[PDB]
Design a protein around this ligand. Sequence first.
Ligand code: NI
Ligand SMILES: [Zn+2]
Lengths: 198, 4
Amino acid sequence: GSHMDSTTIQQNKDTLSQIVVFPTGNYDKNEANAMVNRLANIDGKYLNALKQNNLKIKLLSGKLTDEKEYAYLKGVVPKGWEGTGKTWDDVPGLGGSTVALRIGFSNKGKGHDAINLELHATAHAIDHIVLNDISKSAQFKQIFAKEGRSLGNVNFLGVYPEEFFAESFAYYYLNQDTNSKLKSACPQTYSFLQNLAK
Amino acid sequence: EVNP
Ligand code: NI
Ligand SMILES: [Zn+2]
């Protein structure tokens, strides 16, 4: 809101035009556009790397497992969703070697606990594809051991370093308030993310 | 790789 100029925002939207895929059929076009605008706050260096790797951010109008490429996850219990009685059929956002996201489910509490669905999922793709699983490196493990319970959801974020990475990334990039909150709660994580983007 |  003062840290990225109009030219850089437009460049990031242009990069995202070669990443984001809108679904076939009816969907909420305004909310899909809002998701793209939130994604455009991610540092352009990461967006450029996603584009070069041909990573697509698939926006969906239905359940993830109703897509042919995720049908294999029907009935599978996601990591961290044990005991919920729920499976991938119920999950609104996926990230890793692909990214798939239900339009309308961005906000925290819409079937998931992330501060923002699309930034959290895209962070997983950046971790895995762009940064070669940096969340599982020794350096990040040590930061996670200290700070990984300081964003809440201790049995998920505090247990899986890749989840703490993805959520911290989402705080860093969503808006000025979540960025400030991360700096206060998780100062080593904040510095780690700042240095990754240098 | 997949993650919720
Ligand atoms: Ni700004
Ligand atoms: Zn996650």
